[PDB]
Design a protein around this motif. Structure first.
Motif, PDB file in Angstrom:
ATOM      1  N   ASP A   1     -11.479  13.345  -4.449  1.00  0.00           N
ATOM      2  CA  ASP A   1     -11.132  14.791  -4.149  1.00  0.00           C
ATOM      3  C   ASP A   1      -9.289  14.819  -4.165  1.00  0.00           C
ATOM      4  O   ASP A   1      -8.972  15.809  -3.743  1.00  0.00           O
ATOM      5  N   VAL A   2      -8.804  13.795  -4.809  1.00  0.00           N
ATOM      6  CA  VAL A   2      -7.344  14.046  -5.057  1.00  0.00           C
ATOM      7  C   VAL A   2      -7.174  15.197  -6.152  1.00  0.00           C
ATOM      8  O   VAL A   2      -8.001  15.433  -6.761  1.00  0.00           O
ATOM      9  N   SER A   3      -6.034  15.822  -5.949  1.00  0.00           N
ATOM     10  CA  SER A   3      -5.721  17.032  -6.671  1.00  0.00           C
ATOM     11  C   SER A   3      -4.591  16.635  -7.920  1.00  0.00           C
ATOM     12  O   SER A   3      -3.816  15.314  -7.782  1.00  0.00           O
ATOM     13  N   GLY A   4      -4.623  16.972  -8.992  1.00  0.00           N
ATOM     14  CA  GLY A   4      -3.912  16.853 -10.076  1.00  0.00           C
ATOM     15  C   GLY A   4      -4.729  17.166 -11.509  1.00  0.00           C
ATOM     16  O   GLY A   4      -5.658  17.823 -11.565  1.00  0.00           O
TER      17      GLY A   4
ATOM     18  N   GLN B   1      -7.664  21.355  -3.048  1.00  0.00           N
ATOM     19  CA  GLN B   1      -9.100  20.590  -2.582  1.00  0.00           C
ATOM     20  C   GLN B   1      -9.987  21.679  -2.956  1.00  0.00           C
ATOM     21  O   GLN B   1      -9.949  22.719  -2.435  1.00  0.00           O
TER      22      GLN B   1
END
Ligand SMILES: [Zn+2]
Ligand SMILES: [Zn+2]
Ligand SMILES: [Zn+2]
Ligand SMILES: [Zn+2]
Lengths: 306, 306
Positions: free
Chosen positions: A112-115, A164
């Motif tokens: 669920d990390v953003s990037g 998210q």
């Protein structure tokens, strides 16, 4: 048990790409988002007094269990408010797996990390289409029936680099059973002879977006499988055909000629312009005259303390 | 007279890149959007009974006059409804120049075609910034004072691949005088010793956008200069720093080492996965299972007329 094979699910792509078995710190994972996902779970366990092996075991469990991104809904699996508040309230791409000490479903929060998550690139035939049909392929590694699917797309303002995935940013585009059919020789699935396959019209996005797929079992256990899939449409290059003025059909003559199955697998320099040298100086201009650290006065102003 | 030098104006970039003087049909223009722009004006004149020379003369006049993308407002240049309805109602990137037989301002309608216009790529320091300051540089080839500027950005739903720039899709982000200053040795302008230079905070866009610049003279003639500038922000790759769990500061030992100024000007294969071969088969999957011509039944179904 299963995962999206087309468009490839986020956790499926990280698993297939490998390099996560050794070294135990995840430095062998080539994709930076799969590596950051692994290293976030690894680092989290270490912070909680875990050993290198318990840290590597929890991070490897997240990658290995690509077919078990699941959450138990109980007998009330059709209750939308029960799913969005109790079953998968947050950590949607992880199917709300937040406990490394308890298996199932461990800790899959790295997902669920953003990037800059690597997307499936879908080329557009024409940049004016409103929807693009895609044939979704869901790979069941364990056969479960009765079952149904829900397919969601993110809202146009969702930003994968910073956001998210939440239920408030998802639009339902499919709900109902998907017939269990025979895999094609072409199949991206290799678990058994069967797949879940269907055409869904995907609303066009001018940015990278997410497709959220929920595979729910109709049973008192109410186990559901939730997967994030990263997608992007490639625009066709050139003039928009509708704007193109065509010449009239003509026949010309004169001594100056300049006057009138399978497929294929610097150029902008002209006799009167050097683009390579111009574009290098222009790239330097961008760096020094944009951003909070751009040149304002220092190359023109001299000061001294009096 | 003048044009935007930073971010480079659409018509300025097409002019500087050249290749438009010979052949007369514009086939020497390397950029497809500059070529389609030229060929649209060329083709339009031919359709109206013009000769190859009158067609090439009108198309070359659009490129050559990169500093005269102008419209006369008259003494009532401050009247917004007069500008948006009478002076520049449409063909905004051309500054409403729609008559090839009448000069000024000829026909510059080629510049309003939609498609993959080459943008200035501005890299983001962090993907979470709301605004990015850029130092605009307006190059005056003729010095005119008193004068003022208006800078607009396109709305987030504007699509350069398909949309005409309209006043209803533009947001004003600057209005007022821009002081006339000395060019820096760095300058993208080479007409005289002076430039119009100012910092403007540009609202972040997740897509290619347009910056509309109007340079208005405060005088009874009311000549104004209108330029389109194509821009795009490049996202930073990797994990969003705010999501990154850092490991605790540790010291480790053991016989298995795997367990613990100027700047620089296939890789995703692992010991346990071949990405190159997988990604080639996956590209083929995208082609055959997306779009209106995707495979549905033909590779699995055989029929005959009874
Ligand atoms: Zn199962
Ligand atoms: Zn073909
Ligand atoms: Zn002038
Ligand atoms: Zn440095």
């Amino acid at each position: 048990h299963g995962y999206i094979t087309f468009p490839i699910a986020r956790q499926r792509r990280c698993n297939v790409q490998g390099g996560f078995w050794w070294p135990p710190d995840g430095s062998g994972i080539p994709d930076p988002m799969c590596r950051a996902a692994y290293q976030n779970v690894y680092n989290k366990v270490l912070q909680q007094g875990g050993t290198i092996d318990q840290a590597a075991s929890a991070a490897q469990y997240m990658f290995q269990q690509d077919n078990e991104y699941a959450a138990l809904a109980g007998p009330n699996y059709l209750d939308q408010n029960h799913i969005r508040n109790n079953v998968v309230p947050n950590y949607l791409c992880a199917a709300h797996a937040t406990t490394w000490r308890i298996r199932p479903f461990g800790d899959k929060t790295g997902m669920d990390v953003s990037g800059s998550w690597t997307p499936t690139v879908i080329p557009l035939q024409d940049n004016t289409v409103s929807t693009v049909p895609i044939e979704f392929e869901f790979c069941p590694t364990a056969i479960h029936e009765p079952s149904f699917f829900e397919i969601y797309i993110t809202v146009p303002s969702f930003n994968v680099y910073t956001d998210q995935v939440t239920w408030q940013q998802l639009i339902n585009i499919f709900t109902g059973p998907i017939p269990l059919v025979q895999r094609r020789p072409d199949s991206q699935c290799n678990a058994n002879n069967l797949v879940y396959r269907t055409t869904v019209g995907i609303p066009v996005r001018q940015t990278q977006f997410v497709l959220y797929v929920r595979w729910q079992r109709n049973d008192p256990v109410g186990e559901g499988f939730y997967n994030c899939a990263d997608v992007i449409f490639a625009h066709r290059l050139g003039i928009n055909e509708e704007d193109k003025i065509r010449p009239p059909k003509m026949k010309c003559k004169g001594n100056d000629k300049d006057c009138y199955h399978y497929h294929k697998c610097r150029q902008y320099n002209t006799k009167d312009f050097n683009y390579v040298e111009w574009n290098d100086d222009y790239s330097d201009y961008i760096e020094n005259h944009t951003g909070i650290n751009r040149d304002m006065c220092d190359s023109t102003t001299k000061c001294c303390y009096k």
